[PDB]
Amino acid sequence: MSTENRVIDLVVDENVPYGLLMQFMDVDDSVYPSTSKPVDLTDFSLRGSIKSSLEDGAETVASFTTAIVDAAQGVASISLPVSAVTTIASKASKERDRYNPRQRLAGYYDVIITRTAVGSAASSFRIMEGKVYISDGVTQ
Amino acid sequence: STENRVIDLVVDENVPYGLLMQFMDVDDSVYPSTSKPVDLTDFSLRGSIKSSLEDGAETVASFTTAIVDAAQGVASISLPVSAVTTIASKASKERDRYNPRQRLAGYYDVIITRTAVGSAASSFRIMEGKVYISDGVTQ
Amino acid sequence: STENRVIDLVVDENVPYGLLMQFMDVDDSVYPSTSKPVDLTDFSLRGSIKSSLEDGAETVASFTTAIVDAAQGVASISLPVSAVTTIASKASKERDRYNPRQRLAGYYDVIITRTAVGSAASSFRIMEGKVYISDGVTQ
Amino acid sequence: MRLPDPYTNPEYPGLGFESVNLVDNDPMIRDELPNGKVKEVKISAQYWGINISYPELFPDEYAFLDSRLLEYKRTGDYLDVLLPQYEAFRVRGDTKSVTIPAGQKGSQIILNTNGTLTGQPKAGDLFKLSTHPKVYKITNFSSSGNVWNISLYPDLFITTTGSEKPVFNGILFRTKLMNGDSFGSTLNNNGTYSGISLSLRESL
Amino acid sequence: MRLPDPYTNPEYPGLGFESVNLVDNDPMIRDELPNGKVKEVKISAQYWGINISYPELFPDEYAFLDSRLLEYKRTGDYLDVLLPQYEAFRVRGDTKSVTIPAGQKGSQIILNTNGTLTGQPKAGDLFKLSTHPKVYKITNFSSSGNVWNISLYPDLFITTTGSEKPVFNGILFRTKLMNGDSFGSTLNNNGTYSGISLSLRESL
Amino acid sequence: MRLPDPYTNPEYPGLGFESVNLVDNDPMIRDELPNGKVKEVKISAQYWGINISYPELFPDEYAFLDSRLLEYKRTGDYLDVLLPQYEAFRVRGDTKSVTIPAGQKGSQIILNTNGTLTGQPKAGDLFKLSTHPKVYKITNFSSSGNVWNISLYPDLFITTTGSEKPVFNGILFRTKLMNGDSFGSTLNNNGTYSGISLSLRESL
Amino acid sequence: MFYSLMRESKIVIEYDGRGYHFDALSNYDASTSFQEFKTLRRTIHNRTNYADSIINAQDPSSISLAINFSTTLIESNFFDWMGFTREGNSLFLPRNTPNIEPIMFNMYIINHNNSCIYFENCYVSTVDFSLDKSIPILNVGIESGKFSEVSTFRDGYTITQGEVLPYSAPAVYTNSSPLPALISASMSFQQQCSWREDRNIFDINKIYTNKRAYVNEMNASATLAFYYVKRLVGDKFLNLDPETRTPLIIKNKYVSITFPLARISKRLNFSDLYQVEYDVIPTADSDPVEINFFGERK
Amino acid sequence: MFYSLMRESKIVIEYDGRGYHFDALSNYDASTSFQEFKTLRRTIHNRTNYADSIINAQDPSSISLAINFSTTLIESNFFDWMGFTREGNSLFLPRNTPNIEPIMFNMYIINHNNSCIYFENCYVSTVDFSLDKSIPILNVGIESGKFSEVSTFRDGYTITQGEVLPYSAPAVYTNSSPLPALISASMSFQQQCSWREDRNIFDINKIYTNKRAYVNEMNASATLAFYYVKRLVGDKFLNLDPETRTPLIIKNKYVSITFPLARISKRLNFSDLYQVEYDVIPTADSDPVEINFFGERK
């Protein structure tokens, strides 16, 4: 669980604006089971990006247009428009997944949350990572 | 030291690193969960990272240590973003076929020490292992 | 039970070493074994670290015995950081199989002794094994 | 006195209930009318009954246990027990600054925490007044800010005098043994006392 | 008050009825003459007896069930029991425009449905009046136009006043929990409660 | 007279106690008032009941055991029974220089050891006076210097005359064999005797 | 049409909303079945020949996986899911079982053409591996409550097992004194749960699937096989007497199972070359059993 | 160090203070083990995971020897020790079991470097050999109560088995009329004793070893396999009817087991060539069963 915990995969659907809804919540388990409270997300900015490969020279195929829908309650949203989805689909590998032919590899992604504030606690964390896949479509 | 307690640190690229310890001695013979946070007053931990596990190795980075809470037992081992960038520059490029995000940077240790008047050197090693860099794309 | 005198010591490079022996006398006549500690009177411990068992082997270092809290039986064996450096200097360049940080530095054994407590020199070996240096990174 | 258990004596893990039976004993004048209606009148006091079963006890653990039980039989006092399934510490805080207004009888009770307690006692948990040794059982809970309205299965044996303090943790049943007259322990060739069990019964 | 079942509370699947036992209790004085003729005499009423069995119960399921049972024993209410096998919906419509002629004290209900009800009740189903809690079983049913001729096993416990309304669906047994004088449940060392049984009796 | 055990007679290993049963027999008159208060009354004495079970016995083992039992029944003596689990030697020394103040008729022995005894007795051990055959169990022990405060389960069956001497080790139960009215043992076709049980009672 | 080949499959375990695709899988075995209630109502009126069988429950599935050790140590999550407490890369056997119910997770067995079998309410009930002169492999055994066929699924693109760890000879120690003439060290860990069948009359005319279970016990065990070797006449260290408490460790270059205090029973076989067999279990008051997972360079 | 090879061993049986070294031993098998009392005290307070196991008894050992026939006939002592009465070189099955307890003896399994395993309180519980078209060999089965490791031992330098007897074809007779078409004559003799466990509370905290046993029964049995052969139509001598009493003898050039009166049950198998199988036991009032041991020249 060194890195296994903060990694999930996203599959953006072609010809559809992709929007992922996130809900931060401070869950307390060590002290006592079944205790969870939302994280006050004021001043907790988000930013993410997608690249084709992990090399030093990599192409920025897209970038999430993150937004904090609710300042309190720890609700945030990372989303990208239809043009970004089309760019990802065009700039994706032609090798199809065998177990799911509609999915093809697009690239890698990360999400960093920057809690810049007046208090000298301008920390940064990488809360997400993984691979980005494109699911082909025909309805156009 | 603790040869059986080796843990490999993972530092994210483009992100300042932070790791916090808790020195908290226990005695559960009287009753389970009898743990008292150790006073860390006049304790100063320090460490380093070197490329190879031998003499003459080139130092990669030194952790910016601190004592967050004295007498509460919460120490912190950390280093800023520029040091992480230096580690990423110095890290090897033998990427694994199935963990293409992690590269080996070097080996690390940190030593806690007592600098109390009326006492002597009490250096002791508490961490040991390797430093792995996780690649990043969002910069 | 039987005998377990053979235990291997892993000392850390660049860090002073100190071991704390809680001497004890367990007896299993009664089902809850008696926790009576031995009483440390007229007791001295001696231990040298010598590379290999062959005769004439050079003395790599020598343990420094400390006797504290004689009533409850505990005792301490230690050696300064300079002794640690002298040990690490003569250690072999081949590393242990299970840990790529340890290197065989020599052999050791500590010998308890009663000096005319009853007009008898009742000295017998306590423990034994191999001493392993663990290469550090901090210095 | 206190019945030994792994909480009081952790060095004896053999002590501790292998299975505990918490029975409800409310005598009632039940009458089955010829028209189909069942009429029952509660007159006799209710009392919790505790049936404790012990696992294989080694000779030293049984020596401690029967020493404590024989001290009970000798000095003649009551024997307190602490059921561990009801030891979920769901209410933090100190209850000295909690006032229970006087003149309250029946199942319902009203107590004012004055903004001191943290945690909500859910239904099914135990409850006990500071003065009287009776042990109740919360059946429903409803709070309006600081004031708490608790409904207890057995009606309050004594009317609150305005000084009784709530006890939401560490509740002990003031019980009496019911197996004392003929209490035998068998020793096996394996070296353990097998089938040790107690039939306790709350007194008053 | 409704007994918890996996209709209202499906989050506790252990609260389902592992096996129900609908007992027909109609005490009679039966005498057998030497001439081979057996003679019976009926005075007392007939009451439906329901016996519920339960599987091993987790702490939360037992907590909910015990809280409900203690609430029952506190308020002295009447447990309502729903049998799924008797919940086949045949008669549908409004039961307010149907009229029952008064003065019917036998073992047979004659009602004019006034064409407001669709379907027909089947023999062996459960039938109940809206003004009395006793539950009846339809032993025979003949329909001649809009007037229905429903035959019931228990003799009508009330004389119809003309305001009663037949109830065919959603019928509950207004039971009272027997064996509550000594009610308990043993908690095993694995955390599950075992040995829980509800002997209920229809206290109309 | 001593009951044959594999201490005195190890050549007959079948004479060992396969399972002992130390029964606490203290008859009391227990009455439960309707107000929930259980009340007890004690008049009769407490007697330790010992039940011995045996495995299959070879002809020589049974011959020895039967000869001893018939010698008992002939001379009308008292069988002495030794329990190995109660033979832990804690208190060692001379019990003749220790003094017990007279007039002690309660359930507690205060004795001045006069520094002649090493070690301390443990709770739950077996204790006995030198002038009476009744066997006591130590329920509590507090030592303040040389004077010991030993607490015993059975109330002192004698009033100390000042000449009694405490006995901690080598304690035997002066039992009398019950169920001797119909005492037998079946001999199987394979030559071994089976079905031998000794129900002994402490006849002080 | 589409046939389903075992070699063309992918097993993904769904826990906490993340897919753990367990690559480096040597072999897996699974089966699905249903429970029936078949009664024959032969009467004096009609001595019938046709039974009254209705399918009313899903028999719990027993899935067994054989997984090679890997450099990313995803396989230690099986110890993590089975109940062991975690500190760093070492797994402790807790003194007491933490919770009444086990840790439940879902599992997918993916195949080509959107074909899948969805096992739900699974728990890890057995994990055992033999440290021997062949490549170590841990056979895990999980039990499911409900199986289903689904079109879309969860596929662990990122969370996957790395390269298999190179072979390294096992060695068992007492403190630091090696035990000579090792043959095969087999370790076994279990979470002996039990299904709580709550099939009731409200499930009549419906298919019932087991959902909840409770832990009867957890344990750690090891069977050690040696050659009967003695160094002295009347030796004290190596003999057949039982050892009530002795510190033992079955060590490898990549894994080390530690018994702080062990109860050893010995068994001698007069075979072609005499072999002694140990039966190692932790004692009553022993400290938690350790299981370290070293990826590379310890 | 010193390994222990089965081929480099010597089995000496100690009876009456004399060592009977049983050479001409084809193969032997033995095992030693201990009995444990392992209970898990899971309580509502602490649902523990660590058992309470104590070793308190030695499981009785089951040693099996396969011994070739020899010219000095030391192997007949196994019949002698198992309970048969002796007259000359012939062993009788007594009408009644002589004593309640069997004949106890100790056994050593010697090996190089003063290594030994000492089985004590042994008794011969089974002896069976098959007279067939292969070299006859009698597999004896003894049960021990206590096993131990000793430094010095007893070695039978003089009392030893001679050269193995040459093969000779078996033949079964009725009086003096041969029975045709023999396949395999298997003889079985047993002393079905039982251990009398007397583990009591005085043995707590000690290892218990079985010491005394009693004889449930002795018996002599033989299973004869023939080919279904008939010489006449409706033959009377050779058929499938049971024979309540008939004198039988399974004879060889070096051994002859005699049943003065036998109870024969027949069983026909419709195999490739029809085979009948006998089940020969002595009758109720039959004279003692004979077992003659001819070394050479009868």
Numbering used by the authors:
A (entry chain Q): 1 to 140
B (entry chain R), C (entry chain S): 2 to 140
D (entry chain Z), E (entry chain Y), F (entry chain a): 1 to 204
G (entry chain I), H (entry chain G): 1 to 298
Provide text from the study:
FhuA, an outer membrane E. coli iron-ferrichrome transporter, is the bacterial receptor recognized by T5 (25). We present the structures of T5 tail tip, determined by cryo–electron microscopy before and after interaction with its E. coli receptor, FhuA, reconstituted into nanodisc.
(C) Cryo-EM structure of T5 upper tail tip at 3.5-Å resolution. A BHPpb3 trimer closes the tube and forms the beginning of the central fiber that continues with a pb4 trimer. A long linker runs along the protein down to the tip of the cone, inserted between two neighboring BHPpb3 subunits and contributing to the stability of the closed tube. BHPpb3 results from a tail tube domain duplication/fusion, as TTPpb6. TMPpb2 density is very ill-defined along the tail tube, probably due to a poor interaction network between the predicted coiled-coil of TMPpb2* and the wall of the tube, except in the BHPpb3 cup. There, we could model TMPpb2C 35 C-terminal residues.
